[PDB]
Design a binder for this molecule. Sequence first.
Ligand code: HEM
Ligand code: HEM
Ligand SMILES: N=C(Nc1ccc(CCNCc2cccc(NC(=N)c3ccon3)c2)cc1)c1ccon1
Ligand SMILES: N=C(Nc1ccc(CCNCc2cccc(NC(=N)c3ccon3)c2)cc1)c1ccon1
Ligand SMILES: C[C@H](O)[C@H](O)[C@H]1CNc2nc(N)[nH]c(=O)c2N1
Ligand SMILES: C[C@H](O)[C@H](O)[C@H]1CNc2nc(N)[nH]c(=O)c2N1
Ligand SMILES: OC[C@@H](O)[C@H](O)[C@@H](O)CO
Ligand SMILES: OC[C@@H](O)[C@H](O)[C@@H](O)CO
Ligand SMILES: [Zn+2]
Lengths: 411, 411
Amino acid sequence: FLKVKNWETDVVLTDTLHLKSTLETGCTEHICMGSIMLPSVATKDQLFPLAKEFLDQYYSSIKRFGSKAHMDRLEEVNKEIESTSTYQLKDTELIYGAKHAWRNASRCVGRIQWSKLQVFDARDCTTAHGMFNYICNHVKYATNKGNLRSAITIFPQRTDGKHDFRVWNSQLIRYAGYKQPDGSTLGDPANVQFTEICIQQGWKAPRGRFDVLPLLLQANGNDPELFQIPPELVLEVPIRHPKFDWFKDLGLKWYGLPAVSNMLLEIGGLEFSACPFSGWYMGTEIGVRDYCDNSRYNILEEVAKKMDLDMRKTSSLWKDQALVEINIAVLYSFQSDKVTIVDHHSATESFIKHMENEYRCRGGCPADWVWIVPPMSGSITPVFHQEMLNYRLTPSFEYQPDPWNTHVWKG
Amino acid sequence: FLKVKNWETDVVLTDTLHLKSTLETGCTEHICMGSIMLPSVATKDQLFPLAKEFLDQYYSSIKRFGSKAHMDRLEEVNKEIESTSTYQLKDTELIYGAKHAWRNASRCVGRIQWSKLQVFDARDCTTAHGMFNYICNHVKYATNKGNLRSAITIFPQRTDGKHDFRVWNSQLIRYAGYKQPDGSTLGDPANVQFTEICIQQGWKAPRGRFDVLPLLLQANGNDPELFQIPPELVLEVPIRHPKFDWFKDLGLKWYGLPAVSNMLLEIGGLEFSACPFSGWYMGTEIGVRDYCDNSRYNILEEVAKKMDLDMRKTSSLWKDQALVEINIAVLYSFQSDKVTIVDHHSATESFIKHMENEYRCRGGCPADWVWIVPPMSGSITPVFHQEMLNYRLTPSFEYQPDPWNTHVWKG
Ligand code: HEM
Ligand code: HEM
Ligand SMILES: N=C(Nc1ccc(CCNCc2cccc(NC(=N)c3ccon3)c2)cc1)c1ccon1
Ligand SMILES: N=C(Nc1ccc(CCNCc2cccc(NC(=N)c3ccon3)c2)cc1)c1ccon1
Ligand SMILES: C[C@H](O)[C@H](O)[C@H]1CNc2nc(N)[nH]c(=O)c2N1
Ligand SMILES: C[C@H](O)[C@H](O)[C@H]1CNc2nc(N)[nH]c(=O)c2N1
Ligand SMILES: OC[C@@H](O)[C@H](O)[C@@H](O)CO
Ligand SMILES: OC[C@@H](O)[C@H](O)[C@@H](O)CO
Ligand SMILES: [Zn+2]
């Protein structure tokens, strides 16, 4: 029964939810790995406890734990795992598991919204063209003309392992990255391997900066196929500043819709390798990381130039000064276009408010401080001063290798 | 043999030093506590392994592991722990243990300087007046007319537990905190309990803001006594800005010398409860935390006012904008007065450079990411992108309770 403190408010919360945790963190009693970025087919013996555990808390959730329908559903799944050595979720079980994977995502500061999620059951899908159709419907729905709405699209579960639905893009909407003859990089350096895989598969690149990539969709373990998202469905925010008119001349823009596609959704021991989920941006992921990581767009040089800043010295904080201006601009631009975005102050406050709820009506909230704390102005946000217990609860979103590293090709 | 990655540079380092770790982190395989702020008399049975371990690595250090002088010193300490159930360090062992406590301080970003430390052996001290004399000599030396130099002053080790040397101040130089009739707080809210303990012991407060506190010095477990550091030894930097002339009218100032006094130094199983250590400031501890924590001086309201900023909305980032300006001012002011200070960019770079050294010539470097990452502009500093293994090596600096919570008074 562990205790977490907030040192800005002296609020104390007691955590008993971590007791239900099952999987391992990477840490031991004699070494903490809380800052390691990635922490490291299934038999039917392994599958029933996972279905049992999941189904016990799903029925416990709708205030019908143990009754007739529960014992029947345990027997039902038990029988089906005998018959097929897998099983199939109810539409309701699928929506519970999804929402709860997000709920348990300990690196996610947006989780106050975990219950307002739209689940698109795509488990009838059989082809890359069918995948393309489902994804476009996702983008159109979630985008909602800038009034963004959270959603996930769930393609068929892994079965054997050699018939896996995968979206090879990291995000449904990502800008291309091309290297140059002079070793420099145009576009997003993050995506240069994937941009060239698409070119390898016959993409015809417009070789500029903010080039929306095509989807590469793998269906039933087959070789993946290229599909360009119709551009009318790709909402983009051009970035201007509410003071600096030269900021328009910078010619920056980002897409409205963050939609992660390269993650694995685990529900009752069943693995969905294709499960793109979308919400909206916290401002910092664009202005700080995307725009200012040295290995990303890396624009601190140019914004500081136009700001007329002392760039000779490290200690002028010219990087810091241009970093605040850049994030003022992303927020201002997104908001003037009525496109949903949250600032790192409002986002982190809501997450403390969420934390109170989870500790009250659930007895805890797994949280990864290293990822929860925004990448600028850390300690003026309330989560800096908030102790967080990290533990792994299921249903969950897991990392998975890139398909081109694992795919036996044959074509 | 664990591996840590840097994701900005793709540099990889292998850690075998953590194997020598002994004490526990608070984390288990199923729960990470890397963001909990505090992680929770000794018999002669317990003391020899600790002396043995320490002495084995000290002789291993001067390239004389196992030789005659080593076996004699093990026998010597062994015999003395039989005779007294404690023992005494050589002047050289005391300097090694001190430097290495700092070296192993995993929350310290300044550790590239760990070998350049001045050890003042105060183990002959017997009185609060003697403590006062040693501390003033520390301040004068370490301050060095603004060309700051690192030092530690080590008072006699804990023996029984009821005769403890303690400095009741958190830092040798701290500004006073007074509450008001209207519940507000003048000075440093952090120190309000300690400011009133001093007033309780007859301090005569000048009840303003930046009131240097008196020392409260406990000697050989006796009741502590008040001594005002001669003000000529208290170097102070008035804070101005290199653009905003109204910044002078803000009337801010900080002391040059950070000198922690409330920590416990552990060497070969021997506990020094009074061991004030001093270095110099990273700019952010003043501009970000001291000046802008909500529960500290909390000046973001006033700087943003004078900056003429949109304070209506959270999403204007007016807090962020005034936070960069404030830290530009602290650095600029300290540097114009030739008083040593480091900026959070230079400090964090040096710590990566230090990390390379420790992994090369020592096989590892314990590091606490939660504390290493500066509290503003986190991800534009190179330590944001650097994985860090945290583990507890000894010699070490440990937290300890406040004396007024533990002191059996009798006066
Ligand atoms: C609703 C608005 C949302 C906001 C403001 C938000 C915010 C964030 C942010 C800032 C991060 C850190 C990402 C990074 O720095 O790489 C993150 C991570 C994450 N989010 Fe949320 N998110 C939202 C919606 C969602 C949804 C709908 C899901 C799942 C259905 C989700 C699941 C996750 C997961 C699993 C991570 C961890 C990813 C990783 O470990 O790389 N989020 N979120
Ligand atoms: C030489 C210049 C130094 C710099 C720039 C520096 C920097 C820092 C900073 C910024 C912190 C975080 C403090 C906080 O946020 O509360 C810290 C913590 C710490 N420093 Fe260093 N420091 C220096 C010297 C020293 C010395 C001389 C020692 C010991 C002999 C030391 C031992 C520690 C310890 C033990 C902590 C952890 C304190 C805690 O857990 O509360 N440092 N340092
Ligand atoms: N893995 C490498 N880099 C790498 C790759 C990925 C990451 C994590 C990035 N997740 C992106 C992400 C996840 C979750 C939420 C958001 N944002 C939202 N707001 C949102 C999006 C959808 O809903 N809400 C963004 C971090 C580093 C690597 C390996 C070798 O080199 N680089
Ligand atoms: N413990 C509480 N607060 C609290 C108390 C202390 C801390 C840690 C503060 N260490 C101060 C510190 C330690 C080490 C280095 C520096 N700086 C230097 N540059 C330097 C100083 C000397 O050499 N180098 C500063 C954090 C929070 C509490 C309990 C109840 O309420 N509050
Ligand atoms: C080394 C470190 O673990 C790595 O930089 C992490 C730190 N915290 C992060 N936090 C978020 N939200 N996103 C990230 O990519 C990272 N990267
Ligand atoms: C809750 C959290 O552990 C707490 O705010 C920590 C975070 N990191 C820190 N880092 C430093 N350097 N100093 C601090 O006081 C803290 N406080
Ligand atoms: O929204 C996530 C952003 O794309 C970045 O933070 C990535 O983590 C890589 O920099
Ligand atoms: O130098 C340390 C500063 O005094 C603060 O960071 C304290 O941690 C409390 O805010
Ligand atoms: Zn841990």
